[PDB]
Write a protein that binds this ligand. Structure first.
Ligand code: MG
Ligand code: ZN
Lengths: 53, 8, 83, 39, 78, 103, 158, 263, 1111, 94
DNA sequence: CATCAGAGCCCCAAA
DNA sequence: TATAATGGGTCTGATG
RNA sequence: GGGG
């Protein structure tokens, strides 16, 4: 309660809609989210996949 | 939408 | 704008690329109406035409490289020294 | 694949797609691939 | 009705062979041989002309029949 | 050298520019001779010779005759490869809408 | 290096860990027939118990190998990364574990046997629902991976 | 419209979609000249439309037209162009190819990293044109067309023929491919080592990239023709030149199974 | 030899006739061995009693009869004919205006007959009709997924005999009805039955939310006929609500036992679920003047009371094996028979109102054709009519007990999800949980459990023994998955002191779920562990020690065991290897007691006790569908006293009556220099010496000589432009002699054909006139051996137009068939496997001197790799080897029942006895212990295998009890540093052999339109370089290698011709031109009115047709 | 691995320019029957026939060996196209 | 809330 | 060529 | 319908 949020910071838990993120926080924010959120899946399986791909 | 039924 | 890979794949400049992917008719009707010229920039475009792809040995950066020995490079140097 | 600066002409895009796709078969548990597709 | 157009009188004869052969089959308990058909067809009909009439009465098969065309080698171009 | 590949709409005029003849009959090939029926879907009069450098009725049968159209049968003497390249056309009584642009 | 049936060394600590579970299990069934615990509470307590038991015998399987049989073929093939992982080795020597119902929820009764001791038909059958579900899943999924790879080649090829 | 073995005829579907249209067009030209009523002409014009639409994209609107006595929709122009079985994907982005074969793969522990075991029987057909020219140049036959007659009966083939093939394949590589090709290392170049027998011999270290074991897997062989194709295969696609994964950067050719067990 | 057998479970009833699911279904469908009066109204009969009578003149059906087959089974296989029977039908044409009756027996064509083993011969090829599994007809209540609180009622009838009807209760509180994708208040339909608002509150009445939420007033204000005309308009926009056009359509849709049919099972199900009696297999009827209801209100009453909490109301599990039923061969065929009988009835009504309404016999009023077609169609084009799998006797036996959920009336590969492929708790005892494909079809194709039997309604039943109090009866009871769910069923191995349950706590099931219960509460006990699995799965010894994923592969690979000439049954069996040979009918037994008269390689003769001398001829070396050689060898000698059911001849893959899919080889589990790597297998060259893993294979080559408009083809010996060396093995006529070795390129049948206007082109005429000879009329078109084929000619068959009893298809003169055999030894590439899922390709064949041998000089046969065991988790092969080790020295074979076999103690006891034979002879034969055996023992001691401080004898025995032995490297003589597991294993040679798969092409056939190479080895095809392989070359940046793949090596007609001429001349390949498949793309776009243009950089069009397309 | 591949990758800025150089030079040799080779007889690649040691027919093998020596110069715009095809057809007849 | 377009690769024998 | 005959027989996601 |  009474905390300080960024424009585009999750308030509920769960996945973020990247289109709501693009409008709120912009291109770089979305590109960061997509790369990290995808990598979270491959790392879980034990797949070393370089980010640049 | 059915040619036979239309002509009939 | 943010598009998924399918919508982004179909929205590309090359109709040869998009037609060969998905929604073949939709891609072709809108292309024909607009009289789209495909510049053959990507790889699928050149694979459909059977051209040397613009990558690897095909890249324009390395495709024109010439080879010549010194016993020959210097044999053509003198014939082009006087007239 | 060579631990050195990439050569000009490398079909980077295609490599990136094969790199992301090949591990795809072994993705169990949106949780798992479905989540990769959702992104 | 035929992808290979047949003169309307020849169609009449092809149909006639058909109605005749079915008649025979229905009073023989089996499919009639070419001889039995030439017999019923009447005078001027030998087994040879029954066979030849069926040979030209054969309608073409589709190349896209699940594909059947994939197994046909092109003989024309060297 | 090829460098671009344009795609656009063919006018009825151009669709006739390509065409080598009008297919007037639904006939395919002759049931006796197995040869292409006249003004049918496989007529050599239109789409070209079936045999390399030879007209239908065999009047001209060699490459000493290239581009000549036989007067008895009306078939050009050229490479029979053109049967893959030569367009024909059907002149419609009334116009019909191209379904791709409707649906 | 060979594989003999005796190389699936059943750790002596197994009998104990089962006994401790059969009694910790009999206490959570008191609370259930005594009304203390609800049905959701019972199921969740039992499942936490046996996954915890499973970890205890997998430790025991590997500790028994390292301390006593450091050159046991199964241990050596797993340790070196030549073949097998802890959970497969656990199924050869310790116990099979808990198996899935067709729906997706766990069975409350676990397969107590290992492949060395040999499963009962009902143990063998209960485990069939899980195997079959993984094969179906592996099949319907291979299709979507391929489709995904094609979209990716198609968006990046240039 | 071609005659098959059995003398029977096999015809493309497009002809029956054209005959459909030409009948309806011709009957319309006749119905117009004969001044038929409105209800008749409009019914004919509708059918003419519906014939044009079965020819360009059969099934899109209304019922798909079908040859009688079979529920198979006829193969319209659209159907030919599109889908996985369509023209683009099945014939332009991927073709079948000459100078290629497949066979069962078998482990070849004795192979150098850049090598594979290629059955001499496969190598003969795959390099057949090369083998003819070499046979004429040595003298094992007098003209290339006689040499091809020699290799046509398995008995007529002599011993010096197999020594000619060895001269032929010298220094040149062949491509090995296992399906599915999930990444570029599904195709790798190899110096072929001629072997008796039927099976292809694979190097144990390349089995991980191919995901090939020996429970029955087969692999495709491909012969790079041109000097350019040979140069690309030997420099860029040689197994020994591709040791690190392109995705992670980690080693791909690396000890596994028995190799690790021994060490 | 001695056959020790383990197991303490006493199996009462034995396995049922394993092919009855086929044999019984069809015999019941046909009833040819039943006198017409006595026929029940089912199958073929029921079809006739549904299509007839025909109401115009009224034609009627009296009886049918089946004749005797025109040709014997062997003669149908031989002549490519269908083994079938003539079908006649006695009909009578009753003129419903005069009363005239002309009767006659009309020929309706032939019906294919099922052979003794439950298979079919369609066009001389054996075929099997795979049973289908589908959702049972009946009423089903399933919960709404969009609306958690409400449910949905569904009324499913038999496939293509009625529409699916759904009764969703829309957001509004009156109940809706969705039929044929329309929707409308069920209120209107209910009025048509004659329902009055009082009978809704009176019959229903209890849910004023629903009983009274359904009754709407605008609908009730109209008579049963007034509403029947309202709904006929709510479902056919266009037809004019006539009161004889509405009662014709609706009656036929819902009340007519000719278009709508709840099956005989659908009746029972709906009766039980709703607790009513259904008079007919149909939802409504037309009685006394109007429509009387039967199902609509019972259903509605149930659906409502299950939006409360009313007893008995429960949703249905549509995957329960009480709600899914099997459609056997009889029902599958009868359904196509009912379809080809309704078309014949259509042509009857069309001839009955045009012709001569009084001049009509039944004969010229019935055209069989639409019935011959439908039947011929089910057997040749159906997805359930499969080319028979007769690789070995077990292949066909498994094929016939297979169950498919796909096909006409079932699912579709893409139409099926997770729910249908799951193992349902009710599969237990009915559908094997292991037997199923790996891959796309997983869970869609399955196998009938061993003791399972399909009942008359089509539900699978499994046997259970009755427990009363604590006494188990020998009484057996077959149950459906619905009956089963009412009982606590104990497990098969529950301890029994005689007929009493010996145990205080017994392991049971209650509605599939596992429960620990006391013997008081036990009602039924399992009959055996065999009743839970398939037949293949029941053939895997030590199954209880194997991972399911690997037991599946071992089940399926048995179907692929090629019959071997020295085949032998496994050393470790499960006790089914005899019933399988018996029921597959590949072997030959004694009909009654008697003595054997003569015995020969061709025939056996048996002087039976009845005096009658019977002569059984023996299938000798007949080609099967997959080309394995089916061959029956004699197993009795002249004068042998044979009792009833005694073995007279072994079938293929049979040894003295036991299934013999492979061989018992001496195996050694140990890495071997890499030739063992990743599942490959190493084998001793000794196996080829004693012709182990050698199998015969027969291939048939066929050629036609037909009439042409250019001349007649001729099967001559006079082939042009040839030499006598090429024709040396051809007879007078031009056919290769029986017994000749043919290799690739060899002529099998000489043939000539005339050429066309290809009548030698001048540069050819000039060549021939130079060489003296003159161009010949005909050309060589003979049948040659294809690449990689060959063998010994064993039979030739000539059939000509004109010879007696033969007539070919139109235009064909003669047809010749040449059968070539090849004795196939094992070779590098051939695939082997055991019953546990261990499969591998022979990678190396070592000479006997390199094989790892035992200390007494015995070399091993096979060298498997231990790395294939831990991850796979198929330890059954490990036990199989240990018990195989004992049997090697004791000279025994064991029967170890599934889940009830030999256990480790027992095995150790045999190994100890065996150690005496392996080592006991040694220590009296004048030999002590070996130096290197001691060295190995020094390392075994460090490995915790042996007890320190015991003599070498006690320590070797300790290793022997663990199955390990001392093993010497054959290349060095030094011992393998450790003791290695060695013993006998049963391994099969699988149908996948390199000789079948090796293929290579330089150039060959191209495809008609694309000009790309044909596919397939049979077409001498090219390999497909698909999308992913192009991606691979792109990723390598191999531009020129790819370009050559897309042009020169495929469809660049210019470049591909020019490339070849450069390579035979020694010139580097030319730069490619345009692929012909792109020109086809351009032209197919012009065909769509689209103008494609290839341009330069100055946007000026570039012609890729080289001027051949413009005028 | 190809003999000295690591040094060849060191000679070029992109690995694909190495393949182009090797391929074009390999073709320069095949068209001129190896007359233009910058190797001495002792350097010449050989293959062991049944008869004996003979020149390696594989021109690509030569191109690489020749490349390592340093007796080959490569680069974009060194000499006009056909000015080169003229004075090499002259120096080494076909 | 309806309509349309997608739904992995290569190989075999059959038809 | 002339009785009369007159209306048929799954599964998800994107876009209007 | 099998293979991987
Ligand atoms: Mg594999
Ligand atoms: Zn002419």
């Amino acid at each position: 309660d009474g905390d300080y949020v960024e424009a585009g910071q999750p308030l509920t838990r769960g996945a973020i809609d990247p289109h709501q993120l693009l409008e709120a926080k912009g291109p770089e924010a979305v590109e960061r989210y997509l790369v990290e959120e995808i990598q979270k899946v491959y790392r879980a399986q034990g797949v070393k996949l370089h980010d640049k791909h | 939408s059915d040619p036979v039924r239309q002509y009939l | 704008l943010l598009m998924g890979v399918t919508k982004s794949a179909l929205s590309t400049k090359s109709w040869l690329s998009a037609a060969s992917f998905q929604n073949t008719t939709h891609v072709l009707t809108e292309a024909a109406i607009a009289g789209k010229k495909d510049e053959l920039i990507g790889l699928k475009e050149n694979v459909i035409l059977g051209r040397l792809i613009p990558a690897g040995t095909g890249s324009d950066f390395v495709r024109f490289t010439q080879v010549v020995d010194q016993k020959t490079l210097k044999a053509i140097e003198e014939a082009r020294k006087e007239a | 694949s060579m631990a050195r600066p990439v050569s000009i002409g490398e079909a980077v895009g295609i490599v990136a797609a094969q790199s992301i796709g090949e591990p795809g078969t072994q993705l169990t548990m949106t949780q798992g691939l479905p989540r990769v597709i959702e992104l | 009705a035929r992808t290979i157009r047949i003169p309307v009188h020849m169609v009449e004869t092809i149909n006639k062979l058909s109605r005749t052969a079915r008649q025979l089959q229905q009073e023989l308990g089996r499919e009639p041989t070419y001889e039995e058909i030439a017999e019923a067809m009447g005078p001027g009909w030998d087994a040879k002309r029954v066979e030849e009439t069926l040979k030209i009465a054969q309608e073409p098969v589709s190349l896209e029949t699940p594909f059947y065309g994939d197994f046909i080698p092109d003989e024309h171009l060297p | 050298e090829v460098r671009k590949v344009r795609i656009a709409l063919a006018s009825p005029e151009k669709i006739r520019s390509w065409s080598y003849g009008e297919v007037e009959k639904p006939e395919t090939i002759n049931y006796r001779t197995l040869k292409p029926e006249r003004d049918g879907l496989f007529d050599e009069r239109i789409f070209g010779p079936i045999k390399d450098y030879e007209c239908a009725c065999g009047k001209y049968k060699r490459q000493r005759f290239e581009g000549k159209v036989c007067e008895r049968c009306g078939v050009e003497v050229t490479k029979s490869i053109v049967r893959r390249y030569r367009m024909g056309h059907i002149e419609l009584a009334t116009p019909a809408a191209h379904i791709w642009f409707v649906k | 290096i060979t594989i003999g049936i005796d190389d699936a060394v059943i750790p002596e600590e197994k009998k104990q860990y089962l006994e401790e579970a059969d009694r910790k299990l009999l206490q959570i069934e008191q609370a259930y027939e005594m009304g203390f615990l609800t049905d959701r509470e019972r199921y969740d307590q039992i499942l936490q118990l046996w996954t915890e038991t499973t970890e205890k015998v997998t430790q025991a399987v590997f500790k028994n190998f390292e301390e006593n049989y450091p050159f046991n073929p199964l241990y050596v093939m797993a340790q070196s990364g030549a073949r097998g992982n802890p959970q497969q080795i656990r199924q050869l020597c310790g116990l099979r574990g808990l198996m899935q119902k067709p729906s997706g929820e766990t069975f409350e009764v676990p397969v107590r046997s290992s492949f060395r001791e040999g499963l009962t038909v009902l143990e063998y059958f209960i485990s069939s629902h899980g195997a079959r579900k993984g094969g179906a899943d592996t099949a319907l999924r291979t299709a979507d991976s391929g489709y995904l790879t094609r979209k990716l080649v198609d968006v990046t090829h240039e | 419209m071609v005659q098959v073995d059995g003398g029977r005829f096999a015809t493309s579907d497009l002809n029956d979609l054209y005959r459909r249209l030409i009948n309806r067009n011709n009957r319309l030209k006749k119905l117009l000249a004969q001044g038929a009523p409105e209800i008749i002409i409009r019914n004919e014009k509708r059918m003419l439309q519906e014939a044009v639409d079965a020819l360009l994209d059969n099934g899109r609107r209304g019922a798909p037209v079908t040859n009688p006595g079979s529920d198979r929709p006829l193969r319209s122009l659209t159907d030919i162009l599109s889908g996985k079985q369509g023209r683009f994907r099945q014939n332009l982005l991927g073709k079948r190819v000459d100078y290629s074969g497949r066979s069962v793969i078998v482990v070849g522990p004795q192979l150098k990293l850049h090598q594979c075991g290629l059955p001499k029987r496969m190598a003969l057909e795959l390099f057949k044109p090369f083998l003819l020219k070499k046979m004429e140049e040595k003298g094992i036959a007098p003209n290339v067309k006689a040499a091809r007659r020699m290799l046509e009966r398995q008995r007529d083939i002599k011993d010096e023929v197999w020594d000619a093939l060895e001269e032929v394949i010298h220094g040149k590589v062949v491509l090995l491919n296992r399906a599915p090709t999930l990444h570029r290392l599904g195709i790798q170049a190899f110096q072929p080592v001629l072997v008796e027998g039927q099976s292809i011999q694979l190097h144990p270290l390349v089995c991980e990239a191919f995901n090939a074991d020996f429970d029955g897997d087969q692999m495709a062989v491909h012969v790079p023709l041109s000097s350019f194709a040979q140069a690309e295969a030997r420099i860029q696609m040689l197994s020994a030149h591709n040791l690190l994964s392109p995705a992670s950067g980690e080693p791909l050719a690396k000890p596994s199974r028995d190799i690790i067990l021994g060490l | 030899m001695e056959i020790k057998r383990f197991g303490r479970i006493r199996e009462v009833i034995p396995l049922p006739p394993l092919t009855e699911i086929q044999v019984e279904s069809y015999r019941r469908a046909l009833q040819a061995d039943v006198p017409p009066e006595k026929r029940e109204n089912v199958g073929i009969q029921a079809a006739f009693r549904e299509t007839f009578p025909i109401e115009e003149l009224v034609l009627d059906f009296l009886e049918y009869r089946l004749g005797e087959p025109p040709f014997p089974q062997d003669e149908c296989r031989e002549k490519d004919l269908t083994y079938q029977a003539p079908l006649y039908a006695r009909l009578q044409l009753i003129h419903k205006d005069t009363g005239l009756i002309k009767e006659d027996e009309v020929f309706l064509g032939h019906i294919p007959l099922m052979t003794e083993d439950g298979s079919f011969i369609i066009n001389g090829a054996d075929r099997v009709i795979v049973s289908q599994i589908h959702r049972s007809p009946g009423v089903y209540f399933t919960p709404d997924p969009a609306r958690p609180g409400r449910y949905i009622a569904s009324i499913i009838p038999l496939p293509k005999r009625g529409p699916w009807i759904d009764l969703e209760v829309e957001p509004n509180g009156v109940v809706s009805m969705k039929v044929n994708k329309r929707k409308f208040p069920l209120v209107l339909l209910l009025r048509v039955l004659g329902y009055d608002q009082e009978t809704l509150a009176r019959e229903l009445g209890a849910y004023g939310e629903l009983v009274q939420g359904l009754m709407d007033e605008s609908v009730f204000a109209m008579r049963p006929e007034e509403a029947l005309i309202r709904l006929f308009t709510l479902l056919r926009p266009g037809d004019p609500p006539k009161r004889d056009k509405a009662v014709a359509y609706v009656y036929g849709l819902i009340a007519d036992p000719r278009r709508y049919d709840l099956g005989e099972a659908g009746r029972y199900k709906a009766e039980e679920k709703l607790g009513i009696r259904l008079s007919g297999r149909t939802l409504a009827r037309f009685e006394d003047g109007e429509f009387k209801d039967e199902v609509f209100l019972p259903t509605l009453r149930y659906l409502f009371a299950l939006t409360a909490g009313v007893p008995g109301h429960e949703v249905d599990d549509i995957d329960h094996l009480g709600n899914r039923r099997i459609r056997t061969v009889g029902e599958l065929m009868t359904d196509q028979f009912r379809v080809g009988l309704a078309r014949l009835a259509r042509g009857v009504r069309e001839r009955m109102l045009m012709g001569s309404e009084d001049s009509l016999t039944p004969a010229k009023l019935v055209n069989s054709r639409p019935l011959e077609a439908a039947i011929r169609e089910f057997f040749s084009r159906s997805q359930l009519s499969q080319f028979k799998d007769e690789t070995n006797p077990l292949s066909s036996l498994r094929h016939k007990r297979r169950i498919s959920a796909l096909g006409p009336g079932g699912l579709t590969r893409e139409r099926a999800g997770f729910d249908v492929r799951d193992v349902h708790r009710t599969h237990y005892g009915r559908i094997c949980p292991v037997e199923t494909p790996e891959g796309a079809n997983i869970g869609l194709i399955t196998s009938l459990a061993a003791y399972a039997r399909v009942d008359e309604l089509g539900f699978i039943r499994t046997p259970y023994r009755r427990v009363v109090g604590g006494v188990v009866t020998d009484e057996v009871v077959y149950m459906t998955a619905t009956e089963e769910d009412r009982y606590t069923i104990a497990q098969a191995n529950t301890p029994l002191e005689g007929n009493r349950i010996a145990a205080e706590r017994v392991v049971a099931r209650r509605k599939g779920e596992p429960v620990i219960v006391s013997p008081e509460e036990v009602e039924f006990m399992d009959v055996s562990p065999k009743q839970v699995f398939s037949v293949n799965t029941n053939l895997i010894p030590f199954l209880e020690h194997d991972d399911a994923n690997r037991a599946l592969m071992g089940s399926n690979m048995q179907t692929q065991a090629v019959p071997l000439i020295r085949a032998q049954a496994p050393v470790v069996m499960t006790g089914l290897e005899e019933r399988v040979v018996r029921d597959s009918l590949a072997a030959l037994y004694a009909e009654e007691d008697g003595e054997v008269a003569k015995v020969d390689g061709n025939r056996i003769v048996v002087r039976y006790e009845d005096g009658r001398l019977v002569e059984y001829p023996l299938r000798r070396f007949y080609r099967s569908n997959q080309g394995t050689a089916l061959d029956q060898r004699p197993r009795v000698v002249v004068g042998q006293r044979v009792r009833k059911g005694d073995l007279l001849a072994d079938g293929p893959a049979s040894e003295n009556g036991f299934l013999a899919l492979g061989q018992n080889v001496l195996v050694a589990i140990m890495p071997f220099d890499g030739y063992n790597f990743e599942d490959a297998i190493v084998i001793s060259e000794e196996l080829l010496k004693r012709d182990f893993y050698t199998s015969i294979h027969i291939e048939r080559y066929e050629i036609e000589a037909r009439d042409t408009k250019l001349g007649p083809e001729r099967i001559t010996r006079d082939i042009p432009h040839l030499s006598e060396a090429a024709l040396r093995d051809l007879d007078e006529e031009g056919v290769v002699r029986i017994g000749a070795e043919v290799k690739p390129g060899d002529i099998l049948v000489g043939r000539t054909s005339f050429k066309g206007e290809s009548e030698p082109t001048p540069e050819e005429r000039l060549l021939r006139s130079i060489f003296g000879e003159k161009a010949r009329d005909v050309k060589d078109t003979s049948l040659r051996v294809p690449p990689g084929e060959g063998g010994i000619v064993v039979r030739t068959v000539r059939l000509r137009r004109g010879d007696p009893g033969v007539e070919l298809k139109p235009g064909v003169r003669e047809v010749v068939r040449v059968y070539v055999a090849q004795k196939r030894k094992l070779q590098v590439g051939d695939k082997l496997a055991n019953r546990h899922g261990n499969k591998g390709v022979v990678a190396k064949i070592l000479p006997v001197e390199d094989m790892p041998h035992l200390p007494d000089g015995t070399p091993v046969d096979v060298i498997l790799n231990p790395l294939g065991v831990p991850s796979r988790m198929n330890l059954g092969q490990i036990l199989e080897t240990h018990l195989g080790l004992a049997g090697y020295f004791l000279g025994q074979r064991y029967i170890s029942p599934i889940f009830d076999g030999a256990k480790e103690p027992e095995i150790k006891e045999l190994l100890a006895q065996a150690f005496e034979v392996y080592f006991g002879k040694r220590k009296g034969e004048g030999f002590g212990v070996d130096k290197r055996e001691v060295e190995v023992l020094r390392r075994a001691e460090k490995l915790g295998l042996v007890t320190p401080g015991k003599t070498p004898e006690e320590q070797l025995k300790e290793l022997f009890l663990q199955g390990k032995v001392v093993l010497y490297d054959g290349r060095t003589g030094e011992p393998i540093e450790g003791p290695i597991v060695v013993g006998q294993m049963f391994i099969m040679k699988l149908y996948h052999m390199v000789e079948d798969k090796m293929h290579a092409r330089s150039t060959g056939p191209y495809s008609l339109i694309t000009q790309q190479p044909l596919g397939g080895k049979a077409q001498f095809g090219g390999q497909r370089f698909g999308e992913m392989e192009v991606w691979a070359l792109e990723a390598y940046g191999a531009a020129h290698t790819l370009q050559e793949m897309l042009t020169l090596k495929s469809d660049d007609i210019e470049g591909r011709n020019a490339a070849y001429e450069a390579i035979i001349k020694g010139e580097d390949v030319p730069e490619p031109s345009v692929p012909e498949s792109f020109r086809v793309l351009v032209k197919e776009l012009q065909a769509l009115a689209l103008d494609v243009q290839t341009l330069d950089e100055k946007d000026n069009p570039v012609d890729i047709f080289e001027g051949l397309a413009s005028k | 691995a190809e003999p000295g591949i690591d040094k060849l990758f060191g000679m070029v800025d992109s690995k694909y320019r190495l393949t182009v150089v090797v391929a074009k030079r390999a073709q320069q040799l095949l068209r001129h029957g190896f007359k233009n080779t910058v190797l001495e007889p002792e350097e010449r690649p050989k293959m062991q026939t049944l008869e004996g040691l003979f020149d390696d027919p594989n021109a690509v093998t030569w191109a690489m060996k020749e490349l390592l020596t340093g007796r080959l110069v490569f680069g974009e715009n060194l000499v006009p196209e056909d000015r080169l095809q003229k004075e090499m057809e002259r120096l080494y007849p076909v």
